[PDB]
Each structure stands twice: as C-alpha cells, then as structure tokens.
Design a protein around this ligand. Sequence first.
Ligand SMILES: Cc1ncc(COP(=O)(O)O)c(CNC2=CCCC(C(=O)O)=C2)c1O
Ligand SMILES: Cc1ncc(COP(=O)(O)O)c(CNC2=CCCC(C(=O)O)=C2)c1O
Lengths: 404, 404
Amino acid sequence: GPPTSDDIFEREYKYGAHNYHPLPVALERGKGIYLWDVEGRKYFDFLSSYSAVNQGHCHPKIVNALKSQVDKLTLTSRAFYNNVLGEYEEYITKLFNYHKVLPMNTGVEAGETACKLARKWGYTVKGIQKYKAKIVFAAGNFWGRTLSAISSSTDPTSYDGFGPFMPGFDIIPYNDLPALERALQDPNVAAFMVEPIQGEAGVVVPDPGYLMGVRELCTRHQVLFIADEIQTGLARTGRWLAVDYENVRPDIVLLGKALSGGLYPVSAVLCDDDIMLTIKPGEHGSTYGGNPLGCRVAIAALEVLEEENLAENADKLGIILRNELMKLPSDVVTAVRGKGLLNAIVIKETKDWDAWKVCLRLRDNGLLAKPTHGDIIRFAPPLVIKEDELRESIEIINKTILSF
Amino acid sequence: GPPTSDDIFEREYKYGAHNYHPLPVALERGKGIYLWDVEGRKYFDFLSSYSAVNQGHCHPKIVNALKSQVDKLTLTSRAFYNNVLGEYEEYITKLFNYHKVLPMNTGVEAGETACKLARKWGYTVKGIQKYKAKIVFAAGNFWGRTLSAISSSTDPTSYDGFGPFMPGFDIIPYNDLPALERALQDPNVAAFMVEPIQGEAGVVVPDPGYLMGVRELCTRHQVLFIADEIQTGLARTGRWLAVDYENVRPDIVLLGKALSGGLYPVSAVLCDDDIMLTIKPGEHGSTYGGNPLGCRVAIAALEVLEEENLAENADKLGIILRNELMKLPSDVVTAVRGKGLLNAIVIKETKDWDAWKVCLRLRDNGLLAKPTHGDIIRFAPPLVIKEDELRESIEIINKTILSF
Ligand SMILES: Cc1ncc(COP(=O)(O)O)c(CNC2=CCCC(C(=O)O)=C2)c1O
Ligand SMILES: Cc1ncc(COP(=O)(O)O)c(CNC2=CCCC(C(=O)O)=C2)c1O
C-alpha cells in the first residue's frame, strides 16, 4: 500500500535535515483552495504557502503554460538569449510601471540583488566612499536565509551561531518615522528596505501614513526605498502592491512567491534605469534566472491575478474575514489584524493552551494554518476563494476556537 | 510575424537589466544535444547551460515527471509535509551515501547553506568562539552571486563596488597543498570549500593527488571539506562525482544545475548527521526548497543519468574530444584541458582575433559555445551525445579554428 502520514513524517526525519518542524499533516494533492492528505482528508488551505499560491493550487492556466513551454525549451543559461525572457520583461515592466526588471529565482535572491544594486548605486551615483555604504532595515524583517539576510534579522533563531555577519546593515524599529528620519541623517545610507506589511513577524500592519512618510524621507535624503513585496504583492492585500494603498512608488520593488502561482521559483527586481544600469554586464546573475519556462509560468500567473480580479476579491473578502474574527472572545483571541486576505489572530497563550494546539485542532476540523513566533496564527487562503467557501472556513475557525 | 533574433536582442535591452552580454543568438527550441533559433537554424549545444542539461534538452522522462506531478501538487511550503520530499530524500541520500540531504533551489543557496552548516558546526562541535569561524576558499572559485559568494571571489568583476564584504573568508591558491596545510594551522578554520574542477575559472583541473591531499589535510586538522560539485557532479566529468576519480569522500557535497535536467531550480546539500543536525528546526530554510514538483523532476533527472550510463559515455567521449582538439595548431590553440565532457581550449589572443570571434564563427557554423575570462572557450555538450554526433561537432570546431 501507499505510505501513511506517519510513514511520511518518519522518512523525512531519517533522510532529510531537521531545519523545520512542520504541522503534522502530509499533503499529496492540491486544487484551488483545497489540499488533500494521503489519507484522503480534505482541508481548507489558509496559508497559501505563505502567499505563493494566491491563484490557488494548480491553476489550470498556469499549468497549461508550464506544460506548453516544457515541450519547447526550458533552459539555455544566460550565455544565450531565449525568445521568452524579453516578452516577460516587457509585460512585467509595463504592468508595474518600472523601466527594467532583473529576473532571479527565489525571494532572498531578489533581496540580495536589491542590496547589490543599492551599494553599487550608492558608490557610483550618490558618491559614498567604498566601502561605507549602509542599508537600513526594520526590526522584525524577514527576507530569507542567506548569510546576508540573517545579518539584518532581529530574530536570534535566524542569526545566532551563524556569524560573523555582513557589515553595513543598520536596524531601526518598524512603523517608526522619527526613527527613520534620525537614521537617515547619516549620508552613507544608500537604501532602506522594508515590508509594507511584515509577514513572518506576524502580519504587522504599520499605521496609516507610514509608507507615505517613508517615501518622503527617502526622497528628501536621496536614499533608495526598497519595498519587499514578495509576500504582500500580487493582490494578496487587496491591491496589486500593498504600497498602492498609500499611492506610494518605491525605488526598487521585489516580487516573488505568487509570481509563479507556486509552479516555479520565480522572483523579480523592478526599478528604473538610473538604478538598474549601475550593474554592468558580467557583474551579477544566476543559472536559472530568466529561464523561458519560469517566464512562461509567470506571465500566465500574472494574467490570472488581473483577469480574475483577485485583488478586489481579496479586499471584499478580507473585510468579511476580519469582522467575523473580531466576534471571537477576547479571553481567547487577543487581536485581529491584516489587509485583504493577509490576516492574523493572536492567541492568549496560557501554561497549556497555545497557538500550536489551536492549529492542531484547526487541522482536525478541516482547516490548515500554522503559528509564527509562538502565539500568532496567520489566516491567508488563496485569493480565488468565494464568499460561501470563506464563511464555511470561518465556522471551522469558530468551532475550533470556541472548543477550548 | 514572429520576432526575429534582432528584435529579441532589442527587446531585452529595453526592458531587462544589463547584467549579461550573451552571444548574439536567440533560441526558442531545444531537444537533446540540439538548439534551434527563431530563424529555424540548428546548433550543437556545446555549453549545456554550463552543465545543467547533462541529460540533454527536454529529456522525455524528466518532462513526463514534471507533467505528471504538476496535475497533483506543486507547493505546500515547508509549513506542511508533502508526500514526495521524503521519497526524494531517501533516494538521493542512498545514491551518494550520505545520511541526510537539505533541499534548496539554486546553486548559491546550497553554497550559503554549506557555509551556515560549517560555522554552526565550528561553533557548537569544534568549539571555535563566536564569531571567529573561518572558511577557506581557493582563488578562482565561483559559487554564485550573493553578497557572501562574491566576498570569497578573486574576480574583481564579481565583488568590486559591492562591499563591504562578508568577514571570515580566507583565500589560498587552487591546486596547492602546501598552501592549504599552511592555512589550516589556524584552529579557527571551520571548513575549506573547493571545486574538484574549477568551472567558471576556465575548467582548471588540479594535479593528480590534490583532492586526496585536501581530504587528508582537512581530516588531520578536523576541518570540513566542502566539495562544490554543482557544475562537476552528476556524470559530467565521467564519474558520478568528480571527486570519485581519487576515491575521496568530502564532508559536505553540493549539487545543483543538472540535478533537474534543466527543468526546475533544484539544489542539494549532502552530509552526515554529525554536521547536518547542528541546524535545528526554525533556523534555516526556503520557500520553494523541497517542493514536490522539483523533487519529482530531480528523481527522474537522477534516474536518467544512471540508467543511460551517461558517466561512462562522458568518459569515453571526453577522451576522443580532447585527443582531437590537441591536433589543432599551437599557434592558435594554446592549451586543451578537461575531464569527461567538461573541457576547454585556450585561444592565443592577438590584437584582433580572440575567443569571442571564434565563438561568433562557431555559431555561424552551427555550434554554440562562449568564452570565459577572455581567452578560454568551454566545450561541454550534453552527455547524451553520440560518438558520430561528437565527431561532426569536432569537424565544425576544426573548420572554424582553421578558418582564421
Ligand atoms: C517578505 C519576504 N521577503 C523575502 C522572502 C524570501 O523568499 P524565499 O523564496 O524563501 O527566498 C520571504 C520568504 N517568506 C517565506 C514564505 C514561505 C516559506 C518560507 C520559508 O519556509 O522559509 C519563507 C518573504 O516573506
Ligand atoms: C561551481 C558552482 N557553484 C555554484 C554555482 C551557483 O549556482 P546558481 O544556481 O547559479 O546560484 C555555480 C553556477 N555556475 C553557473 C552556471 C550557469 C550559469 C551561471 C550564471 O549565469 O551565473 C552560473 C557554479 O558553477
């Protein structure tokens, strides 16, 4: 017979690194908002791979693009041109209204590319002396697991025991304009990288006006405003970009995750010529970056978000989700927050009952989520979910929470 | 009508970053050893995307694995278990005879993971004080484009203008055992990372006994021997791993590129429990690392290399290629080197005639290659090439070289 869920857990423990502690569930099928485990049980996916399957699992139009291109050409390396990359570059740069895109594969690679752009721009355009360029980050940031990315983290589990660390990274509190103004008095600051909503930190939503204030301060001190929209972008928060809520145009925009609908690792660095062209030929790249298969997938993935109006759906349905979640008892749910369909609740941890137990029982009742930083449960279903399906999920949440 | 090759070049220049200068050819189809441009012209691929399509372009068994899995499930995130990862982990760890694998996506991510393992092992097992752990690299190394990877490079085009740089990375000459012995007198060295054959540097083959000497020195000083086999592994040099030529077992093995046959970004970090388990749950990972679609592709990709005996083919055919290349006139070809089907020739550059011009004319005559570091042309066709097809390619090389 096939392997059971426990067999699947047991096998990974024996042969795979122990760098995760996943929730005890073993999935083998996904379609739209639903996942199925190897026992055949059906679950609502309320994580969406942390917003990488915004378009739902195995969306037929993205699947069709992958199957069609894989019969033609999948990788030449950037030693040669392929016929797809430029069609995708034109499409994505028009869509977000930046002059150029640099293609990469993973979110952290886009972040690393952004820091390289910022330093090279800082040295060659702003006039900072080599190598005094600084990049400022916000406490609670997450942008990946390279040595550079953990060097800016304030989470000791990310960086403790992995040093020495990348120099030139300063940290200030999130959602704090006086702190950014103070930090930007240093003329050697080249960039400030920030998430419009902090995902891994627990859907930390900054106050209204924060992104407007970041834009103004960065311009006033000619610092590059790097917006990490790898988790918040692509309709998840109710707009094409989370920064659209404040009509703000960052200097560099990072995309990833849902850029492929979950079918391929595709990430992107968007910015205008004055920044993008400080990197000259031979000075940056990637084996798989810009390959034609990922490019066909990402075009189709972006078309799904636009043609199915997923941003407005995420907006309307996010209002319903948060209003219903706020009806839960304060003794159990300490906070509800989010924008669009990127939301989270905070569980009043005791000696016994905590967010991990809630997620175990959510799983028992047919809904999959997971805690972050202990007491914060993220609720982030695919943007293709319908109102009826959302309300059925809310009743699962209510049944679970009100069962303790 | 469709876009011409020049239209394709023009479009990328307008909308994509200028971080590469590819050879002027615009490919739209690949199958086995052949590529076709948008004009319909057929070329021998003598780069294999720098050994990412060892199995040939669009190998039907790898394509079948991707099409089959994409209808089931492509990404859950490591928040949950998927049913494929453990089957791939068991398969790949048995094949190379290491206890555990850590899955990632790109080659540089595997390199970053290796450096994090080395430092965490250095601090928690060897007893190095935080944060004095050192990692030694060889001059000419290439392992990617993150800020950490360029921090160990000796190529100014990689690191100049991108600092300040990651501390704790020392550099010694390649192919130099006295230098490694001298460097390893420092008790704060945690690891030595090295390519068995340096790819990007120009297929720099170390002398016989070098890898044996590296293994002994690393053991004698309890330093981790990290073998970067992302370009040399997976049958390209004529064995499963290039280190197999000297019967050497590194402490960490990195794989990538051909790990997927070019269909998906899949990379791997292989090592035993004593190193792998110094990273605890929550301390390292990746959105797409270990996803079930990449895992199905990599299983099929690895099966192709074994079942079609591509290593022995690469061995036998590499002997023919180098012997024929050594018949070229010394006035034009200054050196021939390589193992298996990872080979290179060195062109005696003049004021006018150089390796770029040779590659332009190779392209004119139906064979695609590209220079590295100016005067070095790599010859690396897919391992599925047959002897007759190889000899037809050699005559193209002869016609081109003997036409100047
Ligand atoms: C806001 C933000 N920026 C960058 C990244 C890094 O993306 P990668 O593709 O993982 O390198 C992230 C990643 N966030 C994650 C989403 C899902 C799973 C995951 C993990 O298991 O590490 C991270 C991000 O959120
Ligand atoms: C020996 C070796 N180690 C690591 C890497 C990095 O792999 P990535 O997947 O690119 O991060 C490489 C990469 N070598 C390359 C092969 C093809 C194309 C390419 C590029 O355009 O940057 C690099 C490697 O060789």
